[PDB]
Amino acid sequence: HHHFNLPPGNYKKPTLLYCSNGGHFLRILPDGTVDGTRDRSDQHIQLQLSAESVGEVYIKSTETGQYLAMDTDGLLYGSQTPNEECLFLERLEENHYNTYISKKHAEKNWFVGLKKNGSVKRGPRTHYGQKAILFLPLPV
After folding, report:
1. Motif Nuclear localization signal in this chain: where?
2. Nearest to 98 by CA among 16, 14, 41, 38
């Protein structure tokens, strides 16, 4: 379904996920809402990735324990428990950035993405070529 160029990083430590599009860090709020913020001091932008299989990851909130997940209509939400909607295909893009494709909706190329105004971009609205889908992992 998709290429297998993988980013060089590892999951030994937590990370921030910075989106170059509008310059926002991906954030999972306590109530389950997902968006982005420019505030680097926010306690809900610290994430921990873990590999379930090579190239497949969970992305979780270190502050709340919630898992990033994409639902059946393509909206991101914070899940309390790991489910099929929480697995993402982590891949290199433009020889530099990390992208995250919904495993469950991989055939439709639904990505994790932030718009320029900081709101999450719905799965079917994302696609290869956009800046909304490009992330750079940064240290906490």
Report:
1. 12-15
2. 16
90 SS3 class: strand
Query: What's the CATH fold of domain 1-140?
Result: Trefoil (Acidic Fibroblast Growth Factor, subunit A) (2.80.10)
Q: What is the C-alpha to C-alpha distance for residues 57 and 87, in angstroms, rounded to an integer?
A: 6
Resolution of the coordinates, Å: 1.6
User: For residue 41, what are the contacts with CB-CB under 8 A and spacing of at least 6?
Assistant: none
User: Residue 58 pairs with which residues in a beta bridge?
Assistant: 50
Give the C-alpha separation, 139 to 18, whole Å. Answer: 10
21 is in an annotated binding site: yes
How large is the C-alpha radius of gyration of the chain? 13
> How many beta carbons lie within 10 A of that of residue 11, not counting itself?
14
Beta bridge partners of 136: 18
Nearest residue to 6 (alpha-carbon basis) of 125, 90, 79: 90
Number of residues written out for the chain: 140
